[model samples]
Target: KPVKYTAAKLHEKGVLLDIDDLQTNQFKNVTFDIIATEDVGIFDVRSKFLGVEMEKVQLNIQDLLQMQYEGVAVMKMFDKVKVNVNLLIYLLNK
Candidate 1:
């Protein structure tokens, strides 16, 4: 799917953004911060999506992928365990 990019704005009414794939047909898989246009605001992405600290999201996925790989393959030594370290990320991408 061609992921949509829609710039959201701030509101005095205390708003929220939900990227529910089923309801809105959108994916919230990508994230990055941006400098707000005016009034010095904050940029928050993946908060409403992952519902966890940003640092843990990738780690969590790595752990899950490690477990899945371990299910069908032989065991690994201490350093050769998970396919999570950097360029090997495609093992967990789906």
Candidate 2:
């Protein structure tokens, strides 16, 4: 299932930017910062999740070919999960 997450801008200087969010079960929301240098043409991303700080150097690809092949049988669990929380009111004498 695809979950929607929110992003808020904290600060931005040049190509560098910062964002913050609250932690959730789907994603460990925290303070995130990224810096993109013109000379290097690479963006550095850093964030702290679960009291652990991690960093990564990102690469931008315009067109990339990535393939994943699965041999297992696929089945449709459910087209959608619908929940109705309501009480039915019946009028005997109308």
Candidate 3:
């Protein structure tokens, strides 16, 4: 399966594909990487970039929705995104 598909499908719905088989998955600090299509201001209330912002940022699947409501143009910026099985579960349980 493609990472792009997994991430996009997750965005379409709050759940992930084949989630039941991912029961034993595990990881640390799960997040997805998305490239910025164009330079944009960081308008999120919390500062995610510690040193400086770049064309890419790591975010959870839920953060994509968070960015959407924050006027971040989710589709425009996130042309491609990637995440693991456990990442979806991590966001779901939180």
Candidate 4:
């Protein structure tokens, strides 16, 4: 099985991968950061996509892949803007 990657793991291990250069399909599971508003919908992704209760937008890889805001801000409704760490994943054999 392939090892999953997380923001903290990458940060603590000092690993860096360009978002665009990533073989998005190669990931077994991934966690990363994004900026978004709590009550606001992140464009087409939806406001409750990550559950508005938590400041962090925790989600899967499929959801992230569905998002079009790559390396850009998704502005819509606003109340609080925050940096969110969300979980993403992929299923590939090592």
TM-score of each: 0.17, 0.29, 0.21, 0.19
Q: How do the candidates rank by TM-score, highest first?
A: 2, 3, 4, 1
Model 4: CA > 4 A from native: 1-56, 69-79, 82-94
lDDT (10s digit) by residue, model 3, range 1-94? 1122233345445333322122324211122333322224222211112223323534455555565457653232223333333433344334
Global lDDT of each candidate: 0.27, 0.26, 0.34, 0.31
Among all windows of 10 consecutive residues in model 3, the one with the lowest summed lDDT is 41-50
Weakest 10 consecutive residues of candidate 4 by summed lDDT? 85-94
| TM-score preference between candidates 1 and 3, better one | 3
Model 2: residues >4 Å from true position, as ranges? 1-29, 38-40, 50-52, 61-94
lDDT tens digits by residue: candidate 1, 8-72:
22111112133223233332432222222223222222222333323212234344446656663
> Roughly what TM-score does model 1 have, to 2 decimal places?
0.17
Q: Show pairs that collide, candidate 2.
A: none
Q: What is the C-alpha RMSD of each candidate to the true structure, in Å?
A: 15.3, 19.6, 12.6, 13.1
